[PDB]
Design an enzyme around this catalytic site. Structure first.
Site, short mmCIF file in Angstrom:
data_model
loop_
_atom_site.label_atom_id
_atom_site.label_comp_id
_atom_site.label_asym_id
_atom_site.label_seq_id
_atom_site.Cartn_x
_atom_site.Cartn_y
_atom_site.Cartn_z
N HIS A 69 -36.64 0.34 56.46
CA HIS A 69 -37.55 1.48 56.62
C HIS A 69 -38.61 1.58 55.51
CE1 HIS A 69 -38.70 4.87 58.83
NE2 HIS A 69 -38.37 5.79 57.94
N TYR A 126 -47.65 13.20 57.24
CA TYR A 126 -46.23 13.07 57.25
C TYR A 126 -45.83 14.15 58.22
CZ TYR A 126 -41.41 12.73 56.50
OH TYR A 126 -40.11 12.69 56.76
N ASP A 146 -34.83 -2.43 60.12
CA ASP A 146 -34.84 -1.01 59.79
C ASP A 146 -33.55 -0.33 60.34
OD1 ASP A 146 -35.55 1.68 59.40
OD2 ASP A 146 -37.66 1.40 59.82
N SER A 167 -43.01 6.81 59.21
CA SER A 167 -41.86 7.60 59.67
C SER A 167 -42.21 8.80 60.56
CB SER A 167 -41.09 8.03 58.45
OG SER A 167 -39.73 7.84 58.69
N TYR A 168 -41.87 10.00 60.14
CA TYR A 168 -42.30 11.14 60.86
C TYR A 168 -43.81 11.04 60.96
CZ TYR A 168 -41.81 15.69 62.96
OH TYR A 168 -41.78 16.74 63.89
#
Ligand SMILES: *[C@@H]1O[C@H](CO)[C@@H](O)[C@H](O)[C@H]1NC(C)=O
Ligand SMILES: *[C@@H]1O[C@H](CO)[C@@H](O)[C@H](O)[C@H]1NC(C)=O
Ligand SMILES: *[C@@H]1O[C@H](CO)[C@@H](O)[C@H](O)[C@H]1NC(C)=O
Ligand SMILES: *[C@@H]1O[C@H](CO)[C@@H](O)[C@H](O)[C@H]1NC(C)=O
Ligand SMILES: *[C@@H]1O[C@H](CO)[C@@H](O)[C@H](O)[C@H]1NC(C)=O
Ligand SMILES: *[C@@H]1O[C@H](CO)[C@@H](O)[C@H](O)[C@H]1NC(C)=O
Ligand SMILES: *[C@@H]1O[C@H](CO)[C@@H](O)[C@H](O)[C@H]1NC(C)=O
Ligand SMILES: *[C@H]1O[C@H](CO)[C@@H](O)[C@H](O)[C@H]1NC(C)=O
Ligand SMILES: [Hg+2]
Ligand SMILES: [Hg+2]
Ligand SMILES: [Hg+2]
Ligand SMILES: [Hg+2]
Ligand SMILES: [Hg+2]
Ligand SMILES: [Hg+2]
Lengths: 728, 728
Positions: free
Chosen positions: B702, B509, B670, B592-593
């Site tokens: 998302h 992450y 998203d 995500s990140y």
């Protein structure tokens, strides 16, 4: 020992087909560009001269994209800053070069972002469309006369077509037709006000922070279509300041009854226009003949002189009503029409007489009427040797229809079995273009006694390069399915050996009227799959396919996704029983209609196919355009054909995809077969827990043709197929 | 223990973690919904009864989504017709059921499509938001008074947040704050007039002929942000004749200079409001303390009790300015503040006095302040054993800050090292909820002599099932990089053997402030990979990670995509030394990140990783929202941080992806990390000739969390890791 034809050979165009594209400019001369000099050639003798020096326009200051020389040769149009829209539409800037002087005209220039431009057929009057309105220039350096004032982006279109008309009805952006005189300018106007919009994202270069939303007026099946109006203006009576008058020609009452289309416009004489209309229910068409009235200054279309075509078996024409070819006096014409046996043949019509007279007949079809003089009608057909996938040029003496000569059949019979042609003015000479089965061959010919003049391009360079590669060969043959002949082709690996079992890839299209088994020579992906991977690549023409009569072609009327899907399955079954295909490695693939069929097949449960690839597939007929879809399916209403619209989606077959490996590919800026279509396929597969492979292509359209995406998609599919077939 | 933890087990939730979610309604009672009965419990004695029988609303006709009991126990709100919007927003229909009677209320009903509703904190007043305006109801059955008139879809939001404020600033849809009395209703109003719109297609069910275009005001980095105003209304002085009087509190002059945010609203007393504001350059925040003037009827914020916070080494707070916790009299408050060594500790502030007094200190941090009474402040920290991924509740005696008791540390030290807590009103009772490393365990306690009262849920049931599963183990430890400890966790296959070489998946992450190495118990995909496929699943907390002080956390300030990335690569190299990893089989994945970091690592050319998977990745910071992005990256202009925004894209590393196998996945709907970001990744890999795999998920956001999509993505990702690791 020789090299094999590789994926990189196909991707980088290493083995290039040489062309000979010319433009006839009179009855005995044509233009041709050589070492980017624009040359004129003399047909009889072959001597050439420089029309426009390669050098001119070095210092012009812009890449010039195309050109168009005025008929009565004083000016040339230079097209630059080209930006493409759809398949035919685009925007450009235009300069005009006065040839009788070394000078570009600097005044009253055609504006930037012009949408279409055309010289009149004789002389040098110009007509163009800018901001959706029509303008006319009588002389290159003079102010234009504005003809229309109603132009409005995405709403009112004068002299150009909207999206469906560009793509499905006219196969052109243009909606301008000059008189043979240059006197009259006719044009169509389309009104899209209540046509719903397709909306999709366009991402562009990385620098764009917010994605753009493209909005295009596009009628989906059953939706409100654009309406159309037709007008004619006298170009010889225009005033510097006073507004030009457009005379309206109204569609016949049998069309105004409901939704209809303008399908074809043809000037028969300086004073007679032929308009061909079609009902939205594409069962009925009417050709209207309209005559200029010296007295009234208006146009009359006598009802009793209308020509009407109807179909009970299916729809009218192949992809549209066929073109009428008028005799010089405009009192009669020739047209391809389905005969009582359901085979398309040439019919002779006299204007104030009702029936027509068939001038060709038999179990084959006329593909097109290519020229007409008073002694002869020249046409292309698949008559030769009963091969529906072959094409030759014929000549009929109009004094006795039984006197018919094949002009191309025996010119070079092992190399050339697929011809197209281009006749000079008055059909004094013609260029023949053989497309296979051997290397393309372009020749020039004289009509008087049909003598061979020369050879224009024989692709000897390619020939020399190809002798060093293990090229595949092509088999063209037929199988019997239920009493009938159905043709197929196979692309076979080099040194083919029938005691082995090869993996088979079925390359499918199979849309209504299509033909994928033919005698054309091609260098494509399949060439690489057979030459390097030793894969057999097969194509089959089943029910719904063209050029073999209406019994086969219309079998699928109002029933897409049915017999044409079934027939691809049966073909693959029979192929499997050939001692040379291994039934453990049969795949299928296609694009567009080919993507739908591949999908329906993979969703059939047949067990015959181990894997497949569908690229930009239609998934559901309600997502496709009105003109194309309704032609074969009618309207998606309960009152008409809704049930089969619902029974013939890919989504309904989602569960059976568990038995196969599927690759689904679609470009996200597809204005034609919307990305939506595949989006609904993936959603259904997901709703049912089926695994599959996917690839979207950012900002690519229906062709996925930008140079990098093209390399990338074929690379990806080659990997997929190699792995399906356990090839390292 | 035989059978293994399977993919289906994870997807189908074969092994459920039981929970004990309770709602305190007073200092000594809580509500608990067992089955669908709502039970009231007495905390001291543990006796309980049924508050609301699951049978009561059998003839309601509507499926009830949630309930909200008024604080005076006289009425219940029933919520139904719930339609989810973003992470916290949704619309719904409401009914109020009168408890003392058994009567639904038929008069003056809350309208359909209500956007937010809330009871006053003490009694039964109601405030709700419909069509972006606030309404108030003094009694359930009486007419509502309209408070605002400016509400306008997508433009003016009264009492609810726009997209950015919902997602990133308040983490909530609500923008209403009742005073403790229920006298005053304070609210915020957001104006998105000039915020640009992100636009994307939503395909919906198969039946939708044309896709919908979703449009949402969403500020990307450096774009125009929404503006905000703050108002307070006396709800005791409303009238049906006259319109509601909203008094505006303006933001401080030092915020008024430029773009700023309203970050936190807290009622300190019946007459005192605390407002925290933050400059768009999130390096300066101001806490304003505002008081009601009984005579004036106004609110005044003395520029002199203003409290200021500035960061030197980075931004303010973790994801936002920390919340103030006011003593009962309102004259003082406690709040977490980075100390002079860069560690987050509790500071005590007196309202008109300079500076603050640190009441905790040390190399570890306070995670949150949980309760405050006269004699004790309660809080959670990672002090115990120096384990940054551990958590425990502590008590500080306010009359001597050296008297600190750990209340959870020794309860069950081998099973419980990660606690959260829920206190009753007045904090007379607390529920501890331990999260690992053993099975979750929920206990109730009395604050007087911190005595354990009862075990609420011990997951005995799950414990027994897990005895019959070959469960992986978890290793939590650290490596020393420079002179600094960096923590990691490994999830290990059962029957682990440090003599064999296992493939390793690095699960990342790694965004700012995050922590992926901890003592939490999880049953997830990594569980399956370890138990069935014998893959080690590791995570690593490198620079930029949280809860270990600012030196580590701020190291990535204005430099996203650098050290957090390099440290993941370095962690994997270090895992390779350790002789139980096969260094030919190292993969990386994230969401995500984590997708962003995954992609930056695959594209760094390290040669360390074989393959990796990126799910809904950020690919370029100019594409992500203003509030989160600008916190860590400043503004993307030439004068501030443009260079680093431009050098930290995934796209610039395209060429490097030729060294690895990549799978990129993203949902098309998203609304947070836009599909755009991955569309630009794919297009960049195509322009450089890099092959990779892809999967879009139609109409997913998302979270890609509808059950079928969730099942389908983890299924696709498992196949991909298995083949990259040559595992059947
Ligand atoms: C071909 O040669 C003849 C004889 O010199 C000449 O009249 C004619 O213009 C030439 N044609 C071209 C196109 O150069
Ligand atoms: C069209 O293009 C050029 C440059 O884009 C501009 O200077 C010119 O004046 C424009 N108008 C014309 C040439 O009609
Ligand atoms: C386009 O058609 C619409 C009918 O919807 C009408 O409002 C408008 O006048 C039409 N425009 C023209 C120029 O025909
Ligand atoms: C608990 O027991 C007491 C004593 O009988 C009773 O008064 C109280 O109402 C009970 N509480 C609950 C929540 O059942
Ligand atoms: C809400 O909608 C339902 C159904 O349309 C209707 O019965 C009701 O009267 C509406 N108004 C309310 C509940 O405030
Ligand atoms: C919202 O902001 C716009 C742009 O400044 C302004 O014109 C408008 O009055 C504002 N409206 C309200 C109700 O604050
Ligand atoms: C109440 O006040 C608002 C503005 O605050 C105004 O727009 C509305 O028309 C008013 N109605 C009455 C009852 O005065
Ligand atoms: C243009 O034509 C000449 C004459 O044949 C040729 O030799 C020359 O290479 C050409 N130059 C260009 C610009 O292609
Ligand atoms: Hg048509
Ligand atoms: Hg047509
Ligand atoms: Hg057709
Ligand atoms: Hg904030
Ligand atoms: Hg903020
Ligand atoms: Hg943070």
């Amino acid at each position: 020992s020789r090299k094999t034809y590789t994926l990189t050979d196909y991707l980088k165009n290493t083995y290039r087909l040489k062309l000979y594209s010319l433009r006839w400019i009179s009855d005995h001369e044509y233009l041709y560009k050589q070492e980017n000099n624009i040359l004129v050639f003399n047909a009889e003798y072959g001597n050439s001269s420089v029309f426009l020096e390669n050098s001119t326009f070095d210092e012009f200051g812009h890449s010039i994209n195309d050109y168009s020389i005025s008929p009565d040769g004083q000016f040339i149009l230079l097209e630059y800053n080209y930006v493409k829209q759809w398949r035919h539409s685009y925007t450009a800037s235009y300069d005009i070069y006065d040839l009788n002087k070394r000078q570009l005209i600097t005044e009253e220039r055609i504006p930037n972002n012009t949408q279409w431009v055309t010289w009149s057929p004789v002389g040098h009057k110009l007509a163009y469309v800018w901001n959706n309105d029509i303008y006319v220039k009588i002389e290159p350096n003079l102010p234009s006369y504005r003809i229309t004032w109603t132009g409005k982006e995405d709403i009112i279109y004068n002299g150009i077509t909207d999206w469906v008309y560009e793509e499905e009805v006219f196969s052109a952006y243009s909606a301008l037709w000059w008189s043979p005189n240059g006197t009259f300018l006719a044009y169509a106007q389309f009104n899209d006000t209540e046509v719903p919009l397709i909306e999709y994202s366009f991402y562009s270069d990385e620098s764009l922070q917010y994605p753009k939303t493209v909005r295009v007026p596009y009628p989906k099946a059953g939706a409100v279509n654009p309406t159309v109006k037709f007008f004619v203006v006298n170009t010889d009576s225009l005033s510097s300041v006073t507004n030009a008058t457009s005379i309206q020609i109204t569609a016949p009452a049998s069309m105004l009854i409901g939704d209809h289309y303008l399908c074809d416009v043809t000037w028969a004489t300086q004073e007679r226009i032929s308009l061909q209309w079609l009902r939205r229910i594409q069962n009925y068409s009417v050709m209207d003949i309209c005559d200029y009235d010296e007295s009234s200054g208006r146009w009359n279309c006598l009802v009793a002189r209308q020509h009407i075509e109807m179909s009970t078996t299916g729809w009218v024409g192949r992809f549209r009503p066929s073109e009428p070819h008028f005799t010089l006096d405009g009192n009669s014409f020739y047209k391809i029409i389905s005969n009582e046996e359901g085979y398309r043949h040439i019919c002779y019509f006299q204007i104030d007489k009702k029936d027509c007279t068939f001038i060709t007949k038999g179990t084959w079809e006329v593909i097109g009427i290519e020229a007409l003089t008073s002694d002869y009608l020249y046409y292309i057909s698949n008559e030769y040797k009963g091969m529906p996938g072959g094409r030759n040029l014929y000549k009929i003496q109009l004094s006795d229809y039984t006197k018919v000569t094949c002009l191309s059949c025996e010119l070079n019979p092992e190399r050339c079995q697929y011809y197209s042609v281009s006749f000079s003015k008055e059909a004094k000479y013609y260029q023949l273009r053989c497309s296979g089965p051997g290397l393309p061959l372009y020749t020039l010919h004289s009509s008087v006694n049909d003598k061979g003049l020369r050879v224009l391009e024989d692709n000897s360079a390619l020939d020399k390069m190809l002798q060093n590669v293990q090229m595949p060969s092509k088999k063209l043959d037929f199988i019997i399915l239920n009493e009938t002949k159905f043709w197929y082709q196979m692309i076979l690996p080099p040194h083919f050996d029938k005691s082995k079992k090869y993996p088979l890839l079925l390359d499918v299209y199979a849309g209504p009227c299509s033909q994928k088994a033919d005698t054309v020579f091609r260098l494509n992906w399949a060439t690489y799959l057979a030459s390097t991977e030793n894969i057999i690549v097969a194509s089959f023409d089943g029910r719904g396919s063209g050029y073999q009569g209406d019994k086969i072609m219309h079998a699928i009327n109002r029933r897409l996704g049915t017999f044409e899907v079934e027939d691809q399955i049966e073909a693959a079954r029979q192929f499997s029983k050939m001692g040379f295909v291994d039934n453990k490695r049969i795949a299928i693939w296609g694009w567009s209609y080919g993507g739908y069929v591949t999908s329906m097949v993979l969703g059939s449960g047949s067990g015959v196919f181990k894997c497949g690839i569908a690229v930009a597939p239609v998934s559901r007929w309600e997502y496709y355009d009105s003109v194309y879809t309704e032609r074969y399916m009618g309207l998606p209403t309960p009152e008409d054909n809704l049930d089969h619209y619902r029974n013939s989606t890919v989504m309904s077959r989602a569960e059976n995809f568990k038995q196969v490996e599927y690759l689904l590919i679609h470009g996200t800026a597809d204005d034609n077969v919307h990305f939506q279509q595949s989006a609904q396929i993936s959603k259904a597969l997901v709703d049912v827990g089926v695994d599959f492979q996917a690839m979207w292509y950012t900002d690519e359209d229906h062709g996925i043709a930008s140079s990098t995406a093209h390399q990338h998609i074929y690379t990806h599919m080659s990997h997929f197929i190699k792995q399906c077939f356990s090839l390292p």
